Swiss-Prot record, chains A, B:
Family statement drawn from the similarity comment of this UniProt entry: Belongs to the nuclear hormone receptor family. NR3 subfamily.
Domain NR LBD: 2-226
Protein known as: Estrogen receptor beta
Disease (UniProt): Ovarian dysgenesis 8: An autosomal dominant form of ovarian dysgenesis, a disorder characterized by lack of spontaneous pubertal development, primary amenorrhea, uterine hypoplasia, and hypergonadotropic hypogonadism as a result of streak gonads.
Subunit organization: Binds DNA as a homodimer. Can form a heterodimer with ESR1. Interacts with NCOA1, NCOA3, NCOA5 and NCOA6 coactivators, leading to a strong increase of transcription of target genes. Interacts with UBE1C. Interacts with AKAP13. Interacts with DNTTIP2. Interacts with isoform 4 of TXNRD1. Interacts with CCDC62 in the presence of estradiol/E2; this interaction seems to enhance the transcription of target genes, including cyclin-D1/CCND1 AP-1 promoter. Interacts with DNAAF4. Interacts with PRMT2. Interacts with CCAR2 (via N-terminus) in a ligand-independent manner.
Primary role: Nuclear hormone receptor. Binds estrogens with an affinity similar to that of ESR1/ER-alpha, and activates expression of reporter genes containing estrogen response elements (ERE) in an estrogen-dependent manner.
Amino acid sequence: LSPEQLVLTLLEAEPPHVLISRPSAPFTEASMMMSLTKLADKELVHMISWAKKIPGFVELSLFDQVRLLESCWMEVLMMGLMWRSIDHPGKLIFAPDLVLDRDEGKCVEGILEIFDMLLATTSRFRELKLQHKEYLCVKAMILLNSSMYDSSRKLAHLLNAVTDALVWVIAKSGISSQQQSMRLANLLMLLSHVRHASNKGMEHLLNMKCKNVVPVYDLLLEMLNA
Amino acid sequence: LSPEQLVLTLLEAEPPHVLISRPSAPFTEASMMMSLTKLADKELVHMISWAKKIPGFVELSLFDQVRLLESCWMEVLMMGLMWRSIDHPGKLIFAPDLVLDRDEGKCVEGILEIFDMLLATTSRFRELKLQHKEYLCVKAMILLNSSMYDSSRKLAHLLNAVTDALVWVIAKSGISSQQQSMRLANLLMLLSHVRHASNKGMEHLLNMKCKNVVPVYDLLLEMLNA
Ligand SMILES: Oc1ccc(-c2noc3cc(O)ccc23)c(O)c1
Ligand SMILES: Oc1ccc(-c2noc3cc(O)ccc23)c(O)c1
């Protein structure tokens, strides 16, 4: 399985876009939290289908597959969120029909700081001129590398193959050899930012759940608690 | 500055280790916290001199300097802890006479979870055989890549010089171009985990401050509230 086939497959596995519209009424802390959670919940199903299409994921132990998923879902969602919002400064494209403005975050306590984060990070990928093929590779890496802790070996092999796919895609651009290393370094240092946004969001979401301001759905309730 | 000279500036920037010792009686939740917040607080004074000795940091604006330090302080402390602990598996060398074992996390509510992370990441650096020069570059990249932001171009420039320095340090090993790209991605992917550990560590510390188990007072408090 060459780095070329792996990217091809990643493109195929791309999860389709989830559609969600704005509720019929001015956004209240309640309506917003519901819109985002329902959206996240629906997305989580597609992520799982995406993970399993990644060569070698299904071959990992059952408990590691869920360990990697429970650990990276917010990161993977916010990275998808960023790619969508890349060409639209100041906006967050949660869905084709759900494009919140920065200031619109002031409708939910504390989420405004999270919107700024996602916006700045997205702004950073924008300046980097993030390519679609790099995004696909970067997204798959967040998954395989999300968890700290015969199966560990396969994982190692899997992250290795994906890293090799990013390198290759980067090289395909025709830029300097010295630039290949700088760009690789730049894309990866942004993973800490994506990770930081994910940590903060989950904190926020968890507290919304405790403040019981939002009911939980089938699958998302299992991920948050983890 | 050429890579080699930048790395020497980084070496000269390395501050002394803060010495602390095991308290009088066995560890109480309160004394253990007093020990950790006491250690951090004294290390922060050293971390500030360290950052000021990094090429270009003092040329950044006053507010930027503080923004970077407030954003990454914990990440930097944990990374140094990892370096000091890299050769002693199962132990966290907070200081020469403060070597806690995994099972000593059970003295504080919720910090055992953090210890495990800290040891897993350290263990990760150990298997990659992290060389001192690499350690120096990564710690500096953490400070410069911390915040999610004329003085703006000064940073991406600063950061790029340290990355180039790391890129050089890896090349000096003489390994394959492919292995040079893999080692860089593996070292950089780990920054995410460090950031993650830093995030939990602070949530925990902020929580303790509320339970007032830890009397986080001066300097350190300025780093937490932010
Ligand atoms: O409290 C919350 C709830 C949802 C999010 C969120 N961020 O990015 C997203 C991308 C999605 O596709 C679906 C939900 C989110 C958040 O950052 C905080
Ligand atoms: O509540 C707390 C208090 C201190 C720490 C800590 N982690 O790593 C460290 C490294 C240091 O050099 C000094 C303090 C800490 C923590 O993770 C949670």
